[PDB]
Amino acid sequence: GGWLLIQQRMDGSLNFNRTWQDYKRGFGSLNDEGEGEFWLGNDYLHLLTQRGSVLRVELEDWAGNEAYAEYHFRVGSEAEGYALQVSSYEGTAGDALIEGSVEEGAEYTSHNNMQFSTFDRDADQWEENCAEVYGGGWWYNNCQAANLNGIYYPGGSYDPRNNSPYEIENGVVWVSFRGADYSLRAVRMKIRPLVTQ
Amino acid sequence: GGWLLIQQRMDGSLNFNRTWQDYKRGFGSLNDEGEGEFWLGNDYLHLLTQRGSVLRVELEDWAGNEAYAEYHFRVGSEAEGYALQVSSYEGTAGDALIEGSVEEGAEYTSHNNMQFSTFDRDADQWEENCAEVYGGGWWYNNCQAANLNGIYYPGGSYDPRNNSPYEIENGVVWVSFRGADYSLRAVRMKIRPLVTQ
Amino acid sequence: GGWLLIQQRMDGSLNFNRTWQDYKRGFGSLNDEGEGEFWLGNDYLHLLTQRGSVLRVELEDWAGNEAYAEYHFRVGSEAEGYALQVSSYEGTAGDALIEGSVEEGAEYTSHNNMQFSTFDRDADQWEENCAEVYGGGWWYNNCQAANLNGIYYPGGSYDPRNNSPYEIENGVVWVSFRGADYSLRAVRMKIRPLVTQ
Amino acid sequence: GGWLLIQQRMDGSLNFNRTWQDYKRGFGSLNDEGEGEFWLGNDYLHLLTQRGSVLRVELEDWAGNEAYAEYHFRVGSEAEGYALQVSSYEGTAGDALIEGSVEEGAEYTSHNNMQFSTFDRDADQWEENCAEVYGGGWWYNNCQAANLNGIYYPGGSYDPRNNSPYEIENGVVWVSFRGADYSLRAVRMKIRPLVTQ
Ligand SMILES: *[C@@H]1O[C@H](CO)[C@@H](O[C@@H]2O[C@H](CO)[C@@H](O[C@@H]3O[C@H](CO[C@H]4O[C@H](CO)[C@@H](O)[C@H](O)[C@@H]4O[C@@H]4O[C@H](CO)[C@@H](O)[C@H](O)[C@H]4NC(C)=O)[C@@H](O)[C@H](O[C@@H]4O[C@H](CO)[C@@H](O)[C@H](O)[C@@H]4O)[C@@H]3O)[C@H](O)[C@H]2NC(C)=O)[C@H](O)[C@H]1NC(C)=O
Ligand SMILES: *[C@@H]1O[C@H](CO)[C@@H](O[C@@H]2O[C@H](CO)[C@@H](O[C@@H]3O[C@H](CO[C@H]4O[C@H](CO)[C@@H](O)[C@H](O)[C@@H]4O[C@@H]4O[C@H](CO)[C@@H](O)[C@H](O)[C@H]4NC(C)=O)[C@@H](O)[C@H](O[C@H]4O[C@H](CO)[C@@H](O)[C@H](O)[C@@H]4O)[C@@H]3O)[C@H](O)[C@H]2NC(C)=O)[C@H](O)[C@H]1NC(C)=O
Ligand SMILES: *[C@@H]1O[C@H](CO)[C@@H](O[C@@H]2O[C@H](CO)[C@@H](O[C@H]3O[C@H](CO[C@H]4O[C@H](CO)[C@@H](O)[C@H](O)[C@@H]4O[C@@H]4O[C@H](CO)[C@@H](O)[C@H](O)[C@H]4NC(C)=O)[C@@H](O)[C@H](O[C@@H]4O[C@H](CO)[C@@H](O)[C@H](O)[C@@H]4O)[C@@H]3O)[C@H](O)[C@H]2NC(C)=O)[C@H](O)[C@H]1NC(C)=O
Ligand SMILES: [Ca+2]
Ligand SMILES: [Ca+2]
Ligand SMILES: [Ca+2]
Ligand SMILES: [Ca+2]
């Protein structure tokens, strides 16, 4: 396989609500088997995408149904805020990154061309701080249609009115697959850097 | 108008790998603050559930998440193997007693209409002994989607490969809430007279 | 606040490795302040407990920690081997008399319903002689989780590898409080009729 | 297996509430069989860790469960307050050193990059004295998620209400494995210095 892993969630044991510097360097780790929760690190991700790449997102719900989304993908440098560039969607999970959510349209929930934010480095399009409330570092707009770095709620369906400190859909979510009130069981991001050509 | 406690786990201080006699009579104790581990006794459950009842199950993981399930409940007599009869699920934990584990399939993992089995009194649907392997007395099929009388593994996530003497998923489990290789921190079962609600 | 003392250990001055006759009659003495080593006598225990009683057990280790356990207690007649009947545990020492050792299981280490055995009158559940080897008269099963009449080792922790003639865990022990290889510094047993307090 | 032992507890007989000077030189003793309670000494720890090392933590609770944690580890010099630097968690006990306590908050209970403190030498991040209250010398933040040098409470489960002088969770603890209110039975820390390749 020419793919390499850049992110994975599988049991909620790792905290994803971290600082700019943790997202920049990478945290967590994977094993021999390739099991474990982690984030590769925005600085190495910038470097790995220099010559272009294909991103593959794999999702799994609490009943074992699966879906995937593939995109052409680039991550900008730290001066560009690690901005996201994606195009050419293909898959079964639905295009949450370019089109955002059907309920509230692209304008506010599209992720394409957004910078990365964290709770201590806000570069989103909201008057408030998305990352603080949604719980992870991500490419926020105002604020999201998808967030694989959100809070791990076990079981699937969750009632946001039951969350604290914020009564919001801050779970591990991909709207066009299971909706904003459904937190996913296992998720991973993998890229194929187009190193030759 | 209130509930009666019929089982509780919270620290693994009590061994639940017990005989048919221990499960018929009851073992364990609660202190006046309601703490401790126990099993009320199948003879007593048959008695209290004779006109029908509502069962409530309350589950807690090692990160503070909680969920519950409610059913209409009745246990059969001794000569009927204290067989379980449940219906009318409602809740947040997911229905592991009637639909069982969608992934493994209801034919093998549903608990409804199953007799109770212990290691010295096997009436499950497996050619082998479920209670022996899974570690406690329960309403086994072949073998389980849930088991609140399983082995208390401290800390939550466990790897069956490390278990001895059987390398299997025999923790305190409720598959539709936390999966099969996560053992819960605190669990309790409570009932109420059908009339009194 | 009147309890009658029935047993006490505190300085190892008294031999507890004695015959059926001596355990039936009683041996040892107390001073004016309630100090000294002693065993009241099983014939008196049957008599005083005929209508039920509350038993209180007090334990003290060599670092100053203390724990207690309370039970409803009865002893049978001589022809019944002065068998132990206990229920309704309450306390902080853990229930070593009814539930036994969490690790070894209730089947072999439970003391409830056992006969009292001495080296000259073995009625335990072992093919060998528990009382010979564990050093005192007790309500042995196969053989124990608790024994307040075992060997008084100095200082707490001991190594059975170092014991003669039997390399075994035969100290003054209460497994759920301090384990099997820690012998306790002071212990006592006391009773009172249910009515009072 | 090129491991050195650097700490070990097994029955609570050695007092761990000591001075900066005792922690710097080392205290306690081990017999030939590698048995005994002791602390190697921060000055010698700094020397053995100059080229990096692997730290192995081994834990045992009062019902026979065991867990371990491995980290890359280094301890700074005395001028740097013997600061802790760990990375690369793997294991089964959960990462209490880098993630801190999920419930109380990582910010306050994470141990990475903290300095060593003792009751007579406070460099913790609290306005009060962590070492004085929690009972031992340790790499305190405000104050802890783990502390193998805490007060030894017999039996496992303890009630903070019953502690004195202070009513807190100051037992021998590793929160992601057994929680803050359960004191462990046997614990050890061992290193493998990377003398290298
Ligand atoms: C680990 O090991 C360390 C080091 O040994 C321990 O740290 C010490 O813990 C002590 C426990 O909290 C801590 O507190 C001291 O308490 C003293 C009080 O003791 C009695 O007497 C004083 C006054 O006498 C009183 O205030 C206390 O309440 C208590 O009882 C009082 O006693 C007086 C005596 O007549 C009575 O009049 C009062 O009525 C009575 N009151 C009550 C409510 O009972 C303090 O005196 C002591 O202060 C010290 O003494 C002077 C006070 O200014 C000063 O010269 C000293 O520098 C210092 O202030 C203190 O408050 C000790 O201070 C801790 N010592 C150190 C070096 O840190 C840990 O407890 C151990 N950890 C664990 C987990 O076990
Ligand atoms: C609580 O009190 C109980 C009652 O006192 C104690 O129980 C008693 O426990 C002892 C120890 O096991 C038993 O001892 C009996 O006496 C002899 C003990 O064995 C020694 O002696 C024989 C032969 O003499 C020998 O083969 C053994 O090897 C051993 O020592 C040997 O001694 C010889 C010299 O004789 C020497 O040359 C050898 O080198 C040496 N061996 C070694 C390795 O050094 C046995 O002979 C006894 O066997 C039977 O014989 C007698 C009856 O005819 C009688 O002694 C025994 O009852 C037995 O039938 C036996 O070993 C006692 O049997 C036992 N008594 C009872 C009533 O149970 C108990 O120990 C104590 N508990 C605690 C914790 O302190
Ligand atoms: C991902 O992690 C981040 C990094 O940790 C977490 O973000 C952090 O989130 C906290 C919590 O929301 C931010 O602090 C907030 O709380 C304080 C106080 O909270 C409580 O008190 C205040 C009033 O004191 C209330 O506004 C809150 O609702 C809470 O309830 C109150 O509690 C009081 C006790 O303090 C009590 O007396 C009062 O009655 C009670 N009221 C109610 C209704 O319960 C807020 O004060 C704080 O606002 C701050 O104001 C300061 C100046 O006033 C500023 O300096 C602070 O920066 C901030 O503006 C804020 O609402 C914390 O700021 C934030 N940290 C960062 C770096 O962003 C994040 O939550 C995690 N997300 C998930 C999903 O986990
Ligand atoms: Ca903003
Ligand atoms: Ca079978
Ligand atoms: Ca026998
Ligand atoms: Ca301080």
B96 with B193, same domain? Answer: yes
Question: Other C-beta atoms within 10 Å of B96: how many?
Answer: 24
- Gap from B58 CA to chain A (nearest CA, Å): 14
Q: Tokens for B109?
A: 């993992």
Ligand minimally distant from the alpha carbon of residue B118: 5
Determine the 3-state secondary structure of A52 from DSSP. Answer: coil
Q: Note whether D154 contacts C61, CB cutoff 8 Å.
A: yes
Q: Hey, of A9, A62, A183, which one would you mutate to test binding to chain B, going by the most B CBs within 10 A of its CB?
A: A62
- For residues D9 and D147, the answer to whether their CB atoms sit within 8 Å is no
Enumerate chain A positions whose Cβ falls within 8 A of a Cβ in D: 13-15, 29, 31
Q: Nearest residue CA, atom 7 of ligand 3?
A: A132
Three-class secondary structure assignment of chain C:
CCCEEEEEECCCCCCCCCCHHHHHHCEECCCCCCCCCEECCHHHHHHHHCCCEEEEEEEECCCCCEEEEEEEEEECCCCCCCCEEEEEEEECCCCCCCCCCCCCCHHHHCCCCCCCEECCECCCCCCCCHHHHHCCCECCCCCCCEECCCECCCCCECCHHHCCCCCCCCECEEHHHHECCECCCEEEEEEECCCCC
Q: How far is D157 from chain B (nearest CA, A)?
A: 8
- B174-189 residues labelled b (16+ CB within 10 A) or e (exposed): bbbbbbbbbbbbbbbb
Structure-block tokens of residue A11: 């049991």
Identify the nearest ligand to the CA of C134 by its number.
2
Tokens matching residue B116: 């109770």
Residue linked to tokens 């502390």? D147
Is D95:D105 a contact under the CB 8 Å cutoff? no
Do both D108 and D67 map to the same domain? no
Closest CA to B61 of B149, B193, B173: B173
Which of A119, A133, A163, A183 is the best mutation target for the ligand 3 pocket, counting ligand atoms within 8 Å of the beta carbon and taking the most?
Answer: A119
Which residue from A13, A64, A154 is facing B178, i.e. has the nearest CB? A154
* Residues of chain B contacting residue A11, judged by C-beta atoms under 8 Å apart: 157, 179, 182
Separation between Cα atoms, residue D5 and residue C181, nearest integer Å: 23
Measured from the Cβ of residue D128, the count of other Cβ atoms closer than 10 Å reads 10
C149-184: buried (b, 16+ CB within 10 Å) or exposed (e) per residue? Answer: bbbbbeebbbeeeebeeeeebbbbbbbbbbbbbbbb
Helices (H) and strands (E) in chain A, counts: 5, 9
Specify the DSSP element, H or E, that contains B29.
strand B27-30
Q: Which of B92, B176, B182 sits opposite A62 (nearest CB)?
A: B176
Structure tokens that stand for A24 in this block: 């920049």
Task: Tell me, yes or no, whether D135 and D176 share the same domain.
Answer: yes
Say if strands C173-174 and D146-147 run parallel, antiparallel, or are unpaired.
unpaired
Positive or negative, the Cα torsion across B43, B48, B49, B54? negative
Point out which residues pair with C38 in neighbouring strands: C8, C28
Q: Do C105 and C180 share a structural domain?
A: yes
CB half-sphere exposure, A44, CA atoms < 13 A:
14
A124 is in an annotated binding site: yes
The answer to whether B15 contacts C107, with C-beta atoms less than 8 Å apart, is no
How many angstroms separate the CA of residue A27 from the nearest CA in chain D? 9
Question: Is the CB–ligand 3 distance for residue A141 below 6 Å?
Answer: no
Contact C141, C114 (CB under 8 A): yes
The DSSP code for D25 is: H
Q: What's the domain count of chain D?
A: 2
Q: Is C34 exposed, middle or buried (0-12, 13-18, 19+ CB in 10 A)?
A: exposed
Residues A60 and B142: their CA atoms lie apart, in Å, by: 26
* Gap between the Cα atoms of D153 and A81, Å rounded: 51
Within this chain, do residues C78 and C120 fall inside the same structural domain, yes or no? no
Atom 15 (ligand 3): residue with closest C-alpha? A165
* C129, C135, C138, C141 alpha-carbon torsion, rounded to 10°: -40
Q: Is the CB of A151 under 6 A from ligand 3?
A: yes
**Contact (CB<8Å) C102/B19:** no
Q: What is the distance between the alpha carbons of residues C57 and C147, in angstroms, rounded to a whole number? A: 12
Beta-carbon contacts of residue D164 (< 8 Å; ≥ 6 apart): none
Q: Is C80 exposed, middle or buried (0-12, 13-18, 19+ CB in 10 A)?
A: exposed
Nearest CA in chain D to B14: D63
CA dist C195 → C192, D135, D192 (Å): 8, 44, 63
Atom of ligand 2 nearest to the CA of C151: 74
Range of the domain at A52: 1-100+187-197
Q: What is the CA(C81)–ligand 4 centre distance, in A?
A: 80
List the one residue out of B29, B27, B11 whose CA is nearest residue B19: B27
Same domain flag for D65 and D142: no
Residue among A146, A114, A115, A150 nearest A132 (CA): A150
What distance lies between CA C124 and its chain's CA centroid? 15
Q: Which atom of ligand 3 is nearest to the CA of D107?
A: 5
User: D66: left (phi > 0), else alpha (psi -120 to 50), else beta?
Assistant: beta
Residue A126 is assigned to a ligand binding site: yes
What CATH number does residue A44 fall under? 3.90.215.10
Cβ pairs C/D, distance under 8 A: 32
Is the same domain home to C110 and C167?
yes
> Resolution reached, in Å?
2.1
Q: Which chains lie within 8 Å of chain A at 3 or more CB pairs, if any?
A: B, D
Q: From which experimental method does this structure derive?
A: X-ray
Supply the DSSP symbol for D182. Answer: B
Q: Could you tell me if C68 and C93 are in contact, meaning their C-beta atoms sit under 8 angstroms apart? A: yes
Ligand 2 atom at minimum distance from C135 CA: 74
Structure-block tokens of residue D118? 């003792």
Phi-psi region of A110 (alpha: psi -120 to 50; beta: other; left: phi over 0): beta
Residue B183 to chain A, least CA–CA distance (Å): 12
Question: Which residue in the block uniquely carries the two structure tokens 């203390």?
Answer: C66
Q: Facing residues of D39 across strands?
A: D7, D27
Dihedral of the alpha carbons of D91, A10, D179, D190, in degrees to the nearest 10: 10
* Alpha carbon separation from D90 to A91, C186, D45, D56, D72 (Å, rounded): 35, 44, 22, 10, 10
Q: What is the DSSP string of D94-159?
A: --HHHH--TTT-HHHH--TTPPPBBTTB--SSSSS-HHHHH-S-B--SSS-SEETTS---TTSB--
Q: Per the structure block, which two tokens stand in for B169?
A: 């998923």
Same domain? For C3 and C87 the reply is: yes
- Atom 3 in ligand 2: which residue has the minimum CA distance? C132
Give distance in angstroms: CA of C106 to centre of ligand 6. Answer: 18
**Residue whose pair of structure tokens reads 């849930």 in the numeric block:** B146
How far does residue D110's CA lie from ligand 7's centre (Å)?
15
- The best mutation among D22, D132, D163, D173 to test binding of ligand 1, ranked by most ligand atoms within 8 Å of the C-beta, falls on D132
- Cα–Cα distance measured from residue B41 to residue B27, given in angstroms and rounded to the nearest whole number: 7
Same domain as A129, residue A90 = no
| D12 contacts on C by Cβ (under 8 Å) | 63
Q: Is B126 annotated as a binding residue?
A: yes
How far apart (Å, rounded) are the C-alpha atoms in residues B117 and B112? 14
CATH of the domain at D134: 4.10.530.10
C138 and C148 housed in the same domain: yes
Chain B residues with beta carbon closer than 8 angstroms to that of C106: 15, 18, 22, 27
Q: How many CB atoms lie within 10 A of CB A153?
A: 24
Indicate if ligand 3 lies below 6 Å from the C-beta of A19.
no
Q: What number of residues does chain A have?
A: 197
User: Are residues C8 and C32 both part of a single domain?
Assistant: yes
Q: Which residues of D touch B (CB under 8 A)?
A: 61, 63, 65, 67, 92-94, 102-103, 156-157, 176-178, 182
Name the β-bridge partners of B67. B59
* Number of DSSP helices (H) and strands (E) in chain D, helices first: 6, 9
The CA D55 to ligand 4 mean position distance, Å, reads: 42
Compute the distance between CA of residue C194 and CA of residue C71 in angstroms, rounded to an integer: 11
d(C-alpha B119, C-alpha B122), whole Å: 6
Best residue among C16, C21, C22, C119 to mutate for probing ligand 2's pocket (most ligand atoms within 8 Å of CB) is C119
Burial of C14 (0-12, 13-18, 19+ CB in 10 A): middle
**Phi and psi torsions of C115, nearest 5°:** -75, 155
A165 Cα to the center of ligand 3, angstroms: 8
Pair A145, A191 in one domain: no
D119 CA from centroid of ligand 1 (Å): 13
Q: Is D170 in the pocket of ligand 1 (CB under 6 A)?
A: yes
